[PDB]
Design a protein around this ligand. Structure first.
Ligand SMILES: *[C@@H]1O[C@H](CO)[C@@H](O)[C@H](O)[C@H]1NC(C)=O
Ligand SMILES: *[C@@H]1O[C@H](CO)[C@@H](O)[C@H](O)[C@H]1NC(C)=O
Ligand SMILES: [Zn+2]
Ligand SMILES: [Zn+2]
Lengths: 245, 30, 245, 30
């Protein structure tokens, strides 16, 4: 997270540090939605070009953490994954169409002031807060340059016509984009390593935090893309309802 | 699930983080 | 369960043997709906006349059992209760109006071919299968006379006008009743000890088993009453959504 | 929750208990 700033404690408790088994190395990001359901980006797990064939054994996750380096004892939570699930029609080939994934956990996970999940958006919530001129918050650990604690930057959602012209890739509608125009002088964008992490918005209605997207490709280190979670909700609920036992 | 997206140190504590206001500055219809 | 018969294995895997701590004694029945949510009758827990002030510490439950006496090892499951919740407007005084309760479990519980929950009924499901001339299945361990295994009897739902005339108590609409008319010669009714246990119906639509009621007062050892689960669903969902973490 | 009320030894096994038919005998509209 570039030109970010330090989160205070329990400001995104649905944050999850997706942290590969051997060797000992931070991977992407991820997000907690149920007490066994982590939401992340597929190119974390699946992406032929960088040898990426990540299976359920091979990674753990770390839930309810501030610092990247250290270990909080009895504060944070070490979790294995009982199953991964990449999206069926997921297009690594072209434009990361449907860059989205789910990872069931081994055991369930108890909640605390530091661990807690995020709400997934409903109808009103997603065609109300997604907008021209509105911001959400992308939280993440990737480069500066390295941050001893979890970062948190707030970025503004770039108009459909504008992402399109600015980038070379064909954006589908199962993504949106965000990042500051060079116009102002607020620089700020998800760096690479912050992939899979939650774009969040605080509903003015119920005061609830909602994941609208997932860092698909931040770049930072132009506008960062995100998979348009809401426009792939129908998928999530098929996977959760059917497995998840 | 149903108590989601309410951080126990903030919205249950009736507090607000440094920059959550910032977000709310950028919404509201007309 | 009188004039019953033996269940085969995993025929009601949502059955739960509500089994008091000291001394070692079967209590009522109960039913599994979520992986931390047991559904039972309040007069199991709360009923001034028979000294009944049962608190969360004082009882465990036993999930995924056939035999009453014995112990199936690695088959069944020993569970404590992290919290009870009697219904707020529950009337022990008069006619057991709203005889219904919920018991959160200590830990969560893994599912098996022998443990599994039951579906709670929706709109169609409850004004479609509740009826004049329709039966469900009340499963239970109480007297014969004692049954070395879990019993299972199927009884028919007695018309509104008929329960009323036959009994002395004012039946509310937050109950219905079932048991055979003396007319036929099929005797059969929930005995006392089978309280709190599930009245179930197999939906002809989705082939799904639904709890419509809970043995409120079987008597057996006249028509057995049941709390009209559906007409108190709204309550369940308030309790589950709000606590249950 | 969502896979509920389907006994793993029966409706997932495509089997039927001794007396579940009995129930279905007593429904069906007209
Ligand atoms: C990943 O590897 C497995 C077996 O090691 C294989 O079945 C699969 O085809 C590979 N997947 C991709 C997307 O290359
Ligand atoms: C049960 O006992 C507790 C304390 O031992 C008391 O607060 C409560 O009033 C009693 N409840 C009933 C229903 O008698
Ligand atoms: Zn909570
Ligand atoms: Zn199952």
């Amino acid at each position: 997270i570039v030109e970010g700033s330090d989160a205070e404690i329990g400001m995104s408790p649905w944050q999850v540090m997706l942290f590969r088994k051997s060797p000992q190395e931070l991977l992407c990001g991820a997000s907690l939605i149920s007490d066994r359901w982590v939401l992340t980006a597929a190119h974390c797990l699946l992406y032929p070009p960088w040898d990426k064939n990540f299976t359920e054994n091979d990674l753990l996750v770390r839930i309810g953490k501030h610092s990247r380096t250290r270990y909080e004892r009895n504060i944070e939570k070490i979790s294995m994954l009982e199953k991964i699930y990449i999206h069926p029609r997921y297009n690594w080939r072209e434009n990361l169409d449907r860059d989205i994934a789910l990872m069931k956990l081994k055991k369930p996970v108890a909640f605390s002031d530091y661990i807690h999940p995020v709400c997934l958006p409903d109808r009103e919530t997603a065609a109300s807060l997604l907008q021209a001129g509105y911001k959400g918050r992308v939280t993440g650990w990737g480069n500066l340059g390295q941050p001893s604690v979890l970062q948190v930057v707030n970025l503004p959602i770039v108009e459909r016509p504008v992402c399109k012209d600015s980038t070379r890739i064909r954006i589908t509608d199962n993504m949106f984009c965000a990042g500051y125009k060079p116009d102002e002088g607020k620089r700020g964008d998800a760096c690479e390593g912050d992939s899979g992490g939650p774009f969040v918005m605080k509903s003015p209605f119920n005061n609830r935090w909602y994941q609208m997207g997932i860092v698909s490709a931040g770049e930072g280190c132009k506008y960062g893309f995100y998979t348009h979670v809401f426009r792939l909700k129908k998928w999530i609920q098929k996977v959760i309802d059917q497995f998840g036992e | 699930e149903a108590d989601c997206g309410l951080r126990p140190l903030f919205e249950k504590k009736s507090l607000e983080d440094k920059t959550e206001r910032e977000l709310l500055e950028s919404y509201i219809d007309g």
